[PDB]
Amino acid sequence: VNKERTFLAVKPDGVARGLVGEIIARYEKKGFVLVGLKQLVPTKDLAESHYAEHKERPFFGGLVSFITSGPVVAMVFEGKGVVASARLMIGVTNPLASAPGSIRGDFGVDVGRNIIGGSDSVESANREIALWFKPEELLTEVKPNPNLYE
Amino acid sequence: VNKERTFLAVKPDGVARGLVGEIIARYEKKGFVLVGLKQLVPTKDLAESHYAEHKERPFFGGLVSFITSGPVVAMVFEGKGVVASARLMIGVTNPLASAPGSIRGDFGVDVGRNIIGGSDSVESANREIALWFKPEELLTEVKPNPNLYE
Amino acid sequence: VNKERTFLAVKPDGVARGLVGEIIARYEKKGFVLVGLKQLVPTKDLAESHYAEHKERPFFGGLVSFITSGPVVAMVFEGKGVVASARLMIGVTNPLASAPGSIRGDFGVDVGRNIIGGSDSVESANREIALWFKPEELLTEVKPNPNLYE
Amino acid sequence: VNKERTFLAVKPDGVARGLVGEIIARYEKKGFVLVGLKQLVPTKDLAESHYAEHKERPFFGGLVSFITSGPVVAMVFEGKGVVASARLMIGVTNPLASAPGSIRGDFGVDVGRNIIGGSDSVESANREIALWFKPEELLTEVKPNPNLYE
Amino acid sequence: VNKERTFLAVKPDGVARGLVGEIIARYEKKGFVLVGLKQLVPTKDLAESHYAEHKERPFFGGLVSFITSGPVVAMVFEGKGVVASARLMIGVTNPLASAPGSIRGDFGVDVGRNIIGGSDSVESANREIALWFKPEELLTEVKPNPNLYE
Amino acid sequence: VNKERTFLAVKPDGVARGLVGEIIARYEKKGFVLVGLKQLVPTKDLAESHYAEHKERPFFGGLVSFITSGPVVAMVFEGKGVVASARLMIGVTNPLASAPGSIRGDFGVDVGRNIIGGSDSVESANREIALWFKPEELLTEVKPNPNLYE
Numbered sequence A, B, C, D, E, F: 001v002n003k004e005r006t007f008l009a010v011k012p013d014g015v016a017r018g019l020v021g022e023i024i025a026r027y028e029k030k031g032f033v034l035v036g037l038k039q040l041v042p043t044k045d046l047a048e049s050h051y052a053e054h055k056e057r058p059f060f061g062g063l064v065s066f067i068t069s070g071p072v073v074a075m076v077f078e079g080k081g082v083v084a085s086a087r088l089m090i091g092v093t094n095p096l097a098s099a100p101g102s103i104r105g106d107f108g109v110d111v112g113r114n115i116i117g118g119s120d121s122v123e124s125a126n127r128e129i130a131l132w133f134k135p136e137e138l139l140t141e142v143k144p145n146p147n148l149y150e
């Protein structure tokens, strides 16, 4: 359905490097609709809950550390196959290996500072969305451009 | 001081036309820092409180009406003389009379649908900011690029 | 009713310098609608008819000469106060004196090679439009973004 | 030889979403030359003739339907291997599966509304060109930037 | 004559904020030709010689100080009325008072950190050029796009 | 330690087509730091020394010929894995086969006129760097954005 939603977040480096507008603009141009948007400073709780799947990973330390060292602009986009498309537009985990045209490919160089993050599946999305947004912080009335869908 | 803050809001038409990223990007490029950011649907209360100065104005009707017909992404930018600069970057009330290069000048044509709004004075700002954001929704730790100020 | 239409034309230098897309994109971004569009090579007739008002002027020679030395993409845009707005976005006759942000201001340096031309009044428009386009080469069903006007 | 030509067309959704300039600009930047350009509203004849190869596929219905629901800006570009290159710049049939950087990859989400179409072979080109343009609507004197070729 | 040349320099903050390409790109788009280009770290000598006219003003101190705190990419552009046009594209001394569309207007906020500097007269140019470049570091064979001039 | 440096050069066609700013801007946006930058006209010596590996190749003739037919802006960028990343951003030898988003993919069409060149290995880099720049023409104090690496 055209109501699939994904969770995306501009990490501290992204926000600090002034890439918030640029990134949002890409998804707006793609046709996806913004249903949730806000800036905050992740709490160590939220951080570990979010990256829960890596708690036993060597990098989990600095990750949670960094992810809370400054503001993060979290957002939710809605659209047909947005979860898979958003990832594609982001690139791969290593910015250096990301193709030109993708977000990481155009702006990053270090795996630790890769500008943005986003849900890797509809499952992970729903979870991460609920985890970061309160029900009333998300639109319900989503009306996209009529020139978008058939 | 370099801690001046202004209130800016992408009106429904702006948000609907997909200009959120583009607009934010301009202020980020200018050097101003994002201290507050969120999307919501203005309530008739907030609407009238915001445009309180025009309650006796002929257009006050449709204004408050429209301003709540859909999502609005409100935001707060901080920086040296941001209130006056932000207005300058916006243009004048009538998009048609706004110079190329300014936001309204580049995207609008109707006074009723002029993409964005912003505080016209430090006074109006403080008021509008407090009016739209809750104290904890705004950063306190604002560290701009060091290449920005002397 | 606000369907005012204007005639704009990317002169040979503009077309040759590959600025067609760029220029169209600006007016599209502004909100104006494209009702007529085509590329051709002006005939000495059309040329003199077009610049009829300068037939006794000392430059009329090279003008008509140049304006037909290569392709020209003529177009018609429709929208509220488009004639005046389009001129504003173009700049002034001398590119060097045109402000940054305007078309001539951003791309030209010589009065003889100023990238684009456009009707300077609703009168001149109607005349120039009819002069360059055949009635069936122009849309009649013009439906703009429902977010542009109120 | 650098005389190869291809047929490209901004479909109604593309035109309606205001992507005409943007798209033309990409091909101009690539180095290809514009030999034919015009806006029109496809007739059911032209439509079926164009998509003749799909008269049986379960989508031929809505396709021809849509392709004529509004203006389309058809165009012809000339240059070394333009047919294959143009397709590459477009992406694949499904916008969601198209890579960032390509036209569909950057602007579309639905297979039915994929912004643009273009000849898939020199054969299909010649046919589609002749089908859409009258001989005198195409330049013959094509002089590209000298810096493009060896 | 279209031989006029001006001296422009991206100051340390500009270079540090990664605006070198962006700035050069503007002048290239305008039609001016690059005759000299290089990156270096101004010496206190060069610095004071350059800003010789301000040796008394209360800011000459930090100015010379800053202008040598890091790399600077100096450059020379050639073209009809380039000195006046370049300044226009830069804006005014105070970035906050510079119009959107101009370099300072779009990227700076502090008079002390105004991204770029440029000769304010043909006189000042010749002097500053000779002062920063060695005769063989400047082209002599300057051939601009033929579409720029009449 | 990640100060890997690479040598890149905007060939005559690139410089002539006015793509210098655009190209530099991409690498600046990527996060790489500019350590060396200058414009010159390659001497037949430098040319053959540079393309030494192709002296017996059938194209070596016109190559060296062209590479010295006009100005070239040589530059050195420093950053984590810059040599491999820079190549990726450039595309493949044939512009037509280069993906959208890469430099050649977006601007070139002919293998002979492919806008830019860059070291294909750390080995080739060191060699080409030393070959094109004098030790004091390269920075030593390289301080990148503190947000780029962890």
Ligand SMILES: NC(=O)c1ncn([C@@H]2O[C@H](COP(=O)(O)OP(=O)(O)OP(=O)(O)O)[C@@H](O)[C@H]2O)n1
Binding pocket: A059, A063, A092, A093, A111, A112, A113, A114, A116, A117, A118, A119, A120
């Ligand atoms: N050194 C490594 O092997 C490694 N893997 C991940 N990381 C850092 O941790 C974040 C999450 O890792 P993931 O494997 O989920 O990658 P991702 O899917 O691209 O990231 P995200 O969840 O933040 O969108 C990554 O975004 C990155 O900052 N380092």
Ligand SMILES: NC(=O)c1ncn([C@@H]2O[C@H](COP(=O)(O)OP(=O)(O)OP(=O)(O)O)[C@@H](O)[C@H]2O)n1
Binding pocket: B059, B063, B092, B093, B111, B112, B113, B114, B116, B117, B118, B119, B120
């Ligand atoms: N028809 C009129 O004369 C008129 N004046 C204002 N308006 C609509 O009401 C909004 C607020 O008016 P203001 O005079 O405050 O203009 P503004 O300062 O540019 O707007 P804002 O407060 O929304 O930033 C305007 O932004 C516009 O949408 N119509």
Ligand SMILES: NC(=O)c1ncn([C@@H]2O[C@H](COP(=O)(O)OP(=O)(O)OP(=O)(O)O)[C@@H](O)[C@H]2O)n1
Binding pocket: C059, C063, C092, C093, C111, C112, C113, C114, C116, C117, C118, C119, C120
């Ligand atoms: N040297 C002069 O004083 C002079 N005045 C005009 N011109 C050339 O002639 C074209 C037509 O003159 P106009 O005064 O009508 O220019 P415009 O109103 O700015 O633009 P356009 O005619 O092309 O729509 C101009 O666009 C320009 O190329 N040279």
Ligand SMILES: NC(=O)c1ncn([C@@H]2O[C@H](COP(=O)(O)OP(=O)(O)OP(=O)(O)O)[C@@H](O)[C@H]2O)n1
Binding pocket: D059, D063, D092, D093, D111, D112, D113, D114, D116, D117, D118, D119, D120
């Ligand atoms: N639902 C489907 O399975 C399907 N297949 C095609 N389509 C729509 O019909 C157009 C023509 O199909 P093609 O396979 O020829 O697409 P194309 O090669 O990418 O583009 P075009 O014909 O429009 O140049 C496509 O561009 C697309 O709009 N829908």
Ligand SMILES: NC(=O)c1ncn([C@@H]2O[C@H](COP(=O)(O)OP(=O)(O)OP(=O)(O)O)[C@@H](O)[C@H]2O)n1
Binding pocket: E059, E063, E092, E093, E111, E112, E113, E114, E116, E117, E118, E119, E120
């Ligand atoms: N605080 C002040 O009153 C003041 N005045 C000048 N400045 C700094 O010194 C630079 C030189 O002053 P100018 O008045 O010559 O500025 P300009 O004409 O815009 O630029 P430039 O000399 O750097 O080409 C200015 O560009 C600016 O960085 N601060």
Ligand SMILES: NC(=O)c1ncn([C@@H]2O[C@H](COP(=O)(O)OP(=O)(O)OP(=O)(O)O)[C@@H](O)[C@H]2O)n1
Binding pocket: F059, F063, F092, F093, F111, F112, F113, F114, F116, F117, F118, F119, F120
């Ligand atoms: N026709 C051919 O098969 C052929 N191969 C190379 N060339 C021309 O010679 C330049 C140098 O060849 P390379 O294979 O080293 O190219 P590259 O590695 O992609 O780039 P560069 O040498 O310029 O850094 C190429 O950039 C290209 O202009 N033509």
Ligand SMILES: [Mg+2]
Binding pocket: A120
């Ligand atoms: Mg993950």
Ligand SMILES: [Mg+2]
Binding pocket: B120
């Ligand atoms: Mg107001």
Ligand SMILES: [Mg+2]
Binding pocket: C118, C120
């Ligand atoms: Mg006129």
Ligand SMILES: [Mg+2]
Binding pocket: D120
């Ligand atoms: Mg097909």
Ligand SMILES: [Mg+2]
Binding pocket: E120
């Ligand atoms: Mg000065």
Ligand SMILES: [Mg+2]
Binding pocket: F118, F120
């Ligand atoms: Mg090589």
